[PDB]
Amino acid sequence: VQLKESGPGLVAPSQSLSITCTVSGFSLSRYSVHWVRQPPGKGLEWLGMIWNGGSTDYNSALKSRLSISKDNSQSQVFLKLNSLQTDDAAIYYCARNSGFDLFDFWGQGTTLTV
Amino acid sequence: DIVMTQSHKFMSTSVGDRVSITCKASQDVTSAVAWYQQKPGQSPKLLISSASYRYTGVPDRFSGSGSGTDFTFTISSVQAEDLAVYYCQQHYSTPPTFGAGTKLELK
Amino acid sequence: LWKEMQYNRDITIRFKFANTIIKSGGLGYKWSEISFKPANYQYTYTRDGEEVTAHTTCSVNGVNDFSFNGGSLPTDFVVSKFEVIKENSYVYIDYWDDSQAFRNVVYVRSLAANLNSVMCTGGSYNFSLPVGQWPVLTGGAVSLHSAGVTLSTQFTDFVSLNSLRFRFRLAVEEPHFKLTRTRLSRLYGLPAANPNNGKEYYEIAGRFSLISLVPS
Amino acid sequence: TLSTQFTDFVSLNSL
Amino acid sequence: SGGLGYKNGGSLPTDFVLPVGQ
């Protein structure tokens, strides 16, 4: 069981963002996946969650920017985030839910420079 | 949006000693606090799922206790591999909320 | 003219156990039955800044029943039946609420729920003999892990009555239980002597997800 | 009495 | 064509756009 991130790494302000978390070792119709971030010099923050069937829960502050979806045949989950600023520079992770909100396995993590 | 605050940012210890790390919750969280470990150059790892329940692949020198608002975390003997930053989570309400972070230092 | 709609809301489940103890007629050294019994509970919590009142009924299935034979004399200590729950058994929790989300659980497409786990541990119960030292049954623990959800409706003549059911899977934990002054060899499970250990309730917190067909 | 058991987006009915 | 062998009836995993059903 593994999780693997991939992204651009560098982006201009007021642009888009697209990151793909490729999973392996389990199925996306039985487990659910989280997304978290960590800015430099800050604690970890929560972004979103997609359920077993396609349905999402979002953070209240970043509700009008991000959207999470997944592909079940080609096992991957992707994230989009638009209208990015100089505050959004962080390292993004993708993790797997085990119980209610316990983060069981973790991803490698890509960094975003703006 | 329960705020979870950690009091200290640094701890210091010898080659074998006991360590104590604490954090408080804003409201009453009925025994639902996780604990994590992120070594430098790595990704985080889950250690203590509930307030006192250990995970399977964890060494025996880790333990936790506490309920209500106060929650503590202890280590019996220190190693050279035990240099990391530690976090306490809240999994009782709808947004999960992490803490600030306490770093351990070798003395 | 109908429509499908989704509800992602939190949930807290507060419950507790019950039991039934009876003795056999005679000099008073022999017990007849130490068994389980369903229990009700009523409470009030808040989600989203709004107060909700809910109800809970807790029952059990798949029960393992034990026994002890002290002798054939009239003064011998004999427990004819006491029963535990261990590792091949289920515990059932009913639940209904005051919200406007339970007004739309009539025609349901799907329903799933992520919940925490809780441990139920045992207490102590003195077997009071009229002459001699009293034995005592003490200990035991299990943990509760979630399973599916069942919706069932009942069509009588008067009006339809429906109920919702949560299922839970068990897994034995430490400490073991023992009976003193006997030869019962330190078994595992949770007996029905003092099941909820002087506490007001147990509690499981989580979140569910409901899809249903509503009129439009 | 009609019951329905929800396991992986499939209804399991009984009468 | 696709996973789980069902696939506009909707957008769920188990709907026809079969392993269980008629």
Side-chain angles (χ1 to χ4, degrees):
Chain A
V1 48
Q2 291 177 356
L3 283 82
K4 180 70 175 178
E5 293 87 1
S6 68
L10 182 63
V11 66
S14 296
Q15 293 296 110
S16 176
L17 181 63
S18 67
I19 296 171
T20 301
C21 178
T22 299
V23 299
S24 178
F26 63 95
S27 296
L28 292 175
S29 295
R30 293 182 184 271
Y31 288 156
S32 62
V33 178
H34 291 281
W35 290 94
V36 292
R37 72 179 182 179
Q38 184 180 5
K42 298 295 186 291
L44 283 77
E45 288 182 353
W46 186 66
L47 291 175
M49 176 184 174
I50 187 166
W51 287 79
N52 294 320
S55 66
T56 60
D57 288 331
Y58 289 152
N59 194 0
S60 296
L62 298 174
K63 185 177 180 180
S64 66
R65 293 181 183 177
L66 58 90
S67 66
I68 302 169
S69 295
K70 66 182 181 180
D71 193 1
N72 296 114
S73 296
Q74 294 180 357
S75 65
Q76 67 182 359
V77 179
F78 59 92
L79 183 141
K80 292 182 181 180
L81 182 66
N82 56 4
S83 297
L84 54 88
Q85 293 86 18
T86 187
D87 188 74
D88 292 331
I91 303 169
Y92 292 183
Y93 295 154
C94 57
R96 192 189 72 184
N97 191 3
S98 65
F100 170 62
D101 284 331
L102 296 173
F103 297 160
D104 198 1
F105 287 97
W106 286 82
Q108 293 180 357
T110 184
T111 185
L112 183 64
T113 303
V114 66
Chain B
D1 197 359
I2 298 171
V3 180
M4 188 69 74
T5 63
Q6 297 186 358
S7 65
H8 298 289
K9 290 183 181 180
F10 292 101
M11 294 296 290
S12 65
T13 185
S14 295
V15 296
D17 199 74
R18 293 177 65 88
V19 182
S20 66
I21 298 170
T22 185
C23 67
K24 294 181 181 180
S26 179
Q27 293 181 357
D28 185 75
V29 173
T30 309
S31 177
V33 166
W35 290 94
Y36 292 90
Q37 177 175 6
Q38 182 182 3
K39 292 181 181 179
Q42 298 295 322
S43 66
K45 298 290 180 68
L46 179 59
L47 270 66
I48 308 299
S49 68
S50 295
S52 64
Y53 182 74
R54 294 182 292 173
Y55 189 75
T56 62
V58 175
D60 202 4
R61 62 188 182 272
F62 296 100
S63 66
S65 66
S67 295
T69 61
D70 290 331
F71 295 96
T72 56
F73 176 73
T74 59
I75 294 170
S76 68
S77 66
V78 183
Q79 291 294 322
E81 293 180 352
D82 294 332
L83 191 149
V85 61
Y86 291 162
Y87 295 102
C88 65
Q89 196 191 4
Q90 177 265 334
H91 57 87
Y92 182 74
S93 66
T94 302
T97 300
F98 286 96
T102 302
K103 291 176 70 175
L104 190 145
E105 293 178 352
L106 183 64
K107 183 175 175 66
Chain C
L1 193 64
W2 293 80
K3 184 174 71 175
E4 289 183 355
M5 190 64 72
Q6 186 183 1
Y7 302 100
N8 289 321
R9 295 181 192 280
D10 285 331
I11 188 169
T12 66
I13 298 169
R14 287 201 280 260
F15 69 101
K16 65 183 178 68
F17 284 153
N19 57 4
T20 300
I21 59 171
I22 56 171
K23 292 176 71 174
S24 297
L27 294 173
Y29 289 95
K30 294 181 176 65
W31 276 259
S32 178
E33 183 178 0
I34 311 296
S35 64
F36 281 99
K37 185 174 74 69
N40 293 318
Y41 186 73
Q42 183 178 1
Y43 59 96
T44 300
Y45 67 99
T46 62
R47 78 184 76 180
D48 291 331
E50 293 179 354
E51 293 179 354
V52 291
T53 63
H55 297 86
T56 304
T57 302
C58 181
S59 67
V60 75
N61 194 1
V63 184
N64 293 316
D65 48 355
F66 284 93
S67 177
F68 174 64
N69 191 3
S72 295
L73 296 175
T75 63
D76 288 333
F77 172 72
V78 174
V79 173
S80 179
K81 178 179 171 66
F82 69 98
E83 61 185 3
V84 309
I85 50 172
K86 54 171 183 67
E87 193 181 2
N88 191 0
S89 65
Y90 292 96
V91 57
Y92 292 155
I93 290 173
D94 291 330
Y95 181 78
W96 65 97
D97 197 75
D98 194 74
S99 297
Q100 65 181 357
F102 275 2
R103 292 180 181 176
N104 297 319
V105 194
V106 180
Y107 296 159
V108 179
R109 174 65 176 85
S110 66
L111 180 61
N114 291 322
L115 277 71
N116 284 319
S117 66
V118 71
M119 287 184 68
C120 297
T121 185
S124 67
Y125 176 73
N126 293 320
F127 290 95
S128 176
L129 298 177
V131 172
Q133 185 181 2
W134 296 352
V136 57
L137 182 62
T138 300
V142 293
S143 67
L144 278 71
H145 302 284
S146 68
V149 182
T150 303
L151 178 62
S152 66
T153 182
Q154 184 179 3
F155 296 105
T156 184
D157 294 332
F158 294 99
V159 68
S160 297
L161 191 146
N162 50 5
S163 178
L164 193 144
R165 175 72 65 82
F166 292 98
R167 296 177 66 249
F168 290 96
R169 181 184 60 81
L170 276 71
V172 295
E173 297 291 328
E174 287 184 354
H176 63 278
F177 68 98
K178 64 182 180 181
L179 184 62
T180 62
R181 301 292 296 162
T182 176
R183 297 185 187 276
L184 274 76
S185 65
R186 294 179 182 176
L187 290 87
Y188 289 93
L190 182 62
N194 191 0
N196 50 9
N197 200 358
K199 292 187 284 185
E200 184 180 1
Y201 51 82
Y202 291 99
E203 185 178 0
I204 302 170
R207 186 175 178 88
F208 64 95
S209 177
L210 187 142
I211 300 170
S212 65
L213 186 66
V214 296
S216 176
Chain D
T1 302
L2 191 146
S3 66
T4 302
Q5 186 176 2
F6 301 101
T7 59
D8 292 331
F9 294 96
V10 173
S11 296
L12 296 174
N13 289 321
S14 66
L15 191 62
Chain E
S1 177
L4 285 173
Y6 288 97
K7 301 178 186 292
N8 205 168
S11 66
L12 273 78
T14 67
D15 56 354
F16 179 70
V17 175
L18 277 74
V20 176
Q22 185 67 42

